[PDB]
């Protein structure tokens, strides 16, 4: 017991902290709650600020594709709505890793739909990955972990940004490099394409020492598509609207069998 | 019968919704005719609660069968929504038990009562939704034995992207008090979900609470979830009946429309109309509203500076 | 029958309904005709329980494009019994989000017979089909094209009407529509407050005075999501620097409901946080610092959130901090 929830099995356990399932005792809603242990934070750099950050973004965050914080409790507990599953935890589950054309494509249209969303609200996710990407039972993708994250002034004229801080793999041209200032947005856009390169084919688009191969510019075999998101220079590189426009993006492409996936309060 | 936004509020008659809703009888002076007025301070609603509530009315326009509660009326007055319906003089069959008949009602008037939910169930299922609270406060029994099934806010559509989902994966929200009358696979959220089936589980809980005047499962909520996860239980058509709404497996489970067809129900010969006035017998509904037995304490049921 | 057969049948009970007038004899066969191949459309399109038949659809399509029976429809949709409008409803809706490779046929009929959306608009003053307007008016504004369409015509100003309506349930269907079409399509929805602001905004004015609780609260909320969008950048910087709009945000910010107060703090907010702010309003902000710097102090003391005790604080500072350039 916590408040009124009570705790279940372990999820998952990501750097930060271990999240285990919880269930609200009075309402019966199923919950996920982020654990935190208070001293484990205060080492990890900027940890006890990434988290404080982050809920702050949630609290004023809303909308279908992005995750939802419920709840803050102390003593340190984030009670988060509750995904059945995460991205890449599907992928991990089968030989393949990767979707279907089809499954990816619904995953990947819904991913556009938060990453507007949240630019929109000038938020800069800067760490866009599958493994950041969960889904509810209902098949819903949200968007998680806002923890290195770029809030943009509402009167700054550009999405322009300093830091890095995302996952090593799916950083840009931009940050193997240092620069100084770029777009934030078309960072998040070099991240989503390196997802959807992933989801869609099973490998990484760079390997490694990592950031040496990026910052120099292979596909295997849409393709259009991915060229446009993985352009090096971010002029060309495609905005949100280009990548809707995109006839890849555009297609309903015939749904096989896709990833259903992968196969926790009774004794409490 | 149109209705302008002007009407004297009497009797308190329910409330509801978190206790934000007073249920009023009232009387609309124009015309005279007493009615139900539903009121809801919206000053203490979320921006969400608002959006819940103007679904309630939409979908209540969109439902037209003899066994549903009509709207004949919703509209602003200050900082309150108001919801105008016809008033059912017996009250809900919530009253009834806990007025009257607290160890339970008589059989037949159980199978006139679930008679007129399945028949409503039918039309929501039919029309592709999933009602969510079937439960004995939301059965109407009119002034003259016409059975009304209500509680349309908890009803989510089952049509999605403009297509018919299956499954639904929806945990309904504001159902605190309905938790004891949800389906198993409602109330445990994983990726099978739930449909049209989970209404028909309650069909039996409010068979059970009917039948024995006390809600199935008082206890605390973590408890009845884990005895959901055992169920609740005359004719041996009626156990039967029962046994059929309760089991653990949706799709065994019988639909309202073949439900309808059970040996349970062959003991309705009249309509109710012409039987179940005289089956709530010992209670006489109310007529003269021109009387203080409105303002009586026992309610109307169960008689027997800037500068710029 | 087929869907050819179905469509036929329904194009021609329709005549007959429409018809000036006839026996009441041929009105209920008509009407029966109307009702049972509606149902038949429905059920092809939705399928049973049987999923829908990929190739019957195909055909349905092309026949109501072929026979003008999709805007019949919605013309006559008054002439339709009670579960038939509902039908006609969940039908248009269906093929409205049928797709064939890029394309998406339906949406392309609608743009080569705009009527079908400006008599859906209608739809809000006539009670008995307003709902159902508003149903598939709300389903065309998901497609860009048809969204365009609505807000680039003069009949889009009809709104403002429409979310004053006594009843609610029509005024809320007519709000959504409208908070739909402001906040889909992004980037339609700036180029058209860019290029229509006067006019938007001394009709958005209108609605920030309403007597309807309802409405000045929502179109409250509204105004302050619009602002912080940024591809709405430009109408911000605009909004911000008018007198008029600081004064009626500071005016609510005293108002009797503690619901529109919090809403106008949302966007006075804004007008503060602004590095370049105008003289008028500047000096607006200047005769009133030390008042403001009381009020916000004080201002719904009765809460603790945290996030707003925050945003207290930043303005308070924000509000200190002020001099002359
Ligand atoms: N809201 C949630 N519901 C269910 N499972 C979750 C949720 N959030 C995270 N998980 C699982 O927990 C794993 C680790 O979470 P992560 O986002 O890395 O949190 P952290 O910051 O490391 N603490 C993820 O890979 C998910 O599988
Ligand atoms: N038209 C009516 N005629 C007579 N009694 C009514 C009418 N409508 C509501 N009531 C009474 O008011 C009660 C509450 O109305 P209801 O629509 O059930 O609100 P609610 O929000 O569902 N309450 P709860 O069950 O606690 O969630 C009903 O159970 C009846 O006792």
Do not use: R
């Given at each position: 017991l916590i408040g009124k929830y009570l705790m279940g099995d372990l999820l998952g356990e990501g750097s930060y902290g271990k999240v285990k399932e919880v269930l609200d005792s009075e309402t019966l809603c199923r919950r996920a709650v982020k654990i935190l242990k208070k001293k484990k934070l205060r080492r990890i750099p900027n940890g006890e600020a990434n988290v404080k950050k982050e809920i702050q973004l949630l609290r004023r965050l809303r909308h279908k594709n992005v995750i939802q914080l419920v709840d803050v409790l102390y003593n340190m507990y984030m009670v988060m709505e509750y995904c059945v599953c995460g991205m890449q935890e599907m992928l991990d589950s089968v030989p393949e890793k990767r979707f279907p054309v089809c499954q990816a494509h619904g995953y990947f249209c819904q991913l556009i739909d938060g990453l507007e969303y949240l630019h929109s609200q000038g938020i800069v996710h800067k760490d866009i990955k599958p493994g950041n990407l969960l889904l509810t039972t209902g098949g819903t993708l949200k968007i998680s972990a806002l923890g290195v994250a770029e809030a943009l002034h509402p009167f700054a004229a550009d999405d322009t940004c300093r830091t890095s801080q995302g996952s090593p793999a799916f950083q840009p041209p931009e940050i193997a490099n240092g620069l100084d200032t770029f777009s934030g947005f078309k960072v998040d856009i070099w991240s989503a394409g390196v997802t959807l390169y992933n989801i869609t084919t099973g490998l990484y688009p760079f390997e490694g020492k990592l950031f040496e191969n990026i910052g120099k510019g292979a596909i295997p075999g849409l393709s259009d598509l991915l060229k446009g998101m993985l352009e090096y220079e971010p002029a060309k590189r495609f905005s949100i609207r280009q990548i809707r426009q995109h006839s890849w993006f555009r297609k309903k492409h015939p749904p096989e069998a896709p990833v259903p996936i992968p196969p926790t309060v009774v004794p409490y | 019968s149109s209705f302008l936004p002007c009407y004297e509020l009497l009797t308190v008659i329910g409330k509801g919704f978190e206790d934000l809703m007073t249920v009023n009888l009232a009387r609309y002076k124009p015309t005279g005719e007493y009615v139900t007025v539903r009121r809801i301070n919206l000053e203490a609603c979320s921006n969400e609660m608002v959006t819940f509530l103007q679904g309630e009315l939409h979908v209540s326009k969109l439902f037209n069968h003899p066994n549903i509660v009509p709207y004949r009326a919703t509209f602003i007055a200050d900082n309150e929504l108001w919801v105008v319906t016809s008033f059912m003089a017996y009250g809900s069959a919530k009253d009834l038990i806990c007025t009257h008949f607290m160890d339970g009602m008589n059989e037949l008037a159980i199978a006139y009562i679930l008679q007129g939910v399945l028949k409503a169930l039918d039309y929501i299922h039919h029309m592709g939704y999933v009602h969510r609270s079937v439960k004995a406060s939301h059965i109407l029994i009119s002034v003259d034995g016409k059975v009304y099934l209500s509680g349309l806010r908890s009803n989510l559509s089952m049509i999605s992207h403009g297509q018919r989902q299956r499954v639904v994966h929806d945990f309904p929200k504001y159902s605190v008090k309905v938790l004891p009358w949800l389906s198993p696979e409602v109330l445990q959220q994983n990726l099978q979900g739930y449909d049209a089936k989970s209404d028909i589980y309650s069909v039996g809980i409010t068979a059970c609470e009917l039948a024995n005047g006390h809600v199935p499962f008082d206890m605390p909520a973590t408890q009845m979830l884990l005895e959901k996860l055992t169920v609740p239980c005359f004719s041996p058509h009626f156990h039967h009946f029962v046994e059929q709404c309760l089991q653990r497996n949706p799709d065994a489970r019988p639909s309202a429309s073949t439900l309808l067809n059970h040996s349970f129900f062959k003991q309705i010969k009249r309509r109710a109309s012409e039987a179940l006035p005289e089956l709530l017998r010992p209670v006489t509904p109310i007529?003269?509203?021109?009387?203080?037995q409105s303002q009586?304490?026992?309610?109307?049921?169960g008689l027997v500076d800037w500068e710029f | 029958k087929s869907p050819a057969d179905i469509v036929k049948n329904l194009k021609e009970s329709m005549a007959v309904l429409e018809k000036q007038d006839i026996s009441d004899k041929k009105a209920e066969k008509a009407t029966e005709e109307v009702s049972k191949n509606l149902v038949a459309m429905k059920e092809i399109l939705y399928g049973t329980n049987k999923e829908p038949q990929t190739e019957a659809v195909a055909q349905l399509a092309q026949e109501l494009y072929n026979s003008g029976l999709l805007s019949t429809l919605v013309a006559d949709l008054q002439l339709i019994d009670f579960e038939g409008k509902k039908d006609v409803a969940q039908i248009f809706n269906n093929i409205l989000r049928r797709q064939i490779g890029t394309r998406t046929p339906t949406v392309e009929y609608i743009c080569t017979q705009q009527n079908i959306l400006f008599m859906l608009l209608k739809g809000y003053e006539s009670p008995e089909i307003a709902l159902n307007c508003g149903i598939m008016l709300r389903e065309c504004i998901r497609h860009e094209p048809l969204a365009k369409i609505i807000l680039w015509s003069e009949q889009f100003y009809d709104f403002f009407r429409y979310v004053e309506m006594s009843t609610f349930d029509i005024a809320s269907d007519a709000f959504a529509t409208f908070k739909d079409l402001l906040t889909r399509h992004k980037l339609l929805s700036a180029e058209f407050l860019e290029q229509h602001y006067d006019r938007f905004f001394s009709e958005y004015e209108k609605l920030l005075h309403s007597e309807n609780y309802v409405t000045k609260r929502q179109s409250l909320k509204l105004l302050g999501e619009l602002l912080l969008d940024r591809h709405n950048f430009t109408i911000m910087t605009k909004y911000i620097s008018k007198p008029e709009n600081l004064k009626l945000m500071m005016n609510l910010l005293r108002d009797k409901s503690r619901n529109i107060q919090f809403e106008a703090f949302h966007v006075f907010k804004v007008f503060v946080a602004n590095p370049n702010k105008t003289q008028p309003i500047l000096d607006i902000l200047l005769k009133n610092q030390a008042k403001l710097i009381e009020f916000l102090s004080k201002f719904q003391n009765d809460r603790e959130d945290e996030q707003f005790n925050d945003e207290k604080t930043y303005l308070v500072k924000q509000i200190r901090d002020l001099k002359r350039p």
């Open positions: - | 007529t003269n509203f021109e009387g203080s009586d304490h026992s309610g109307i049921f | -």
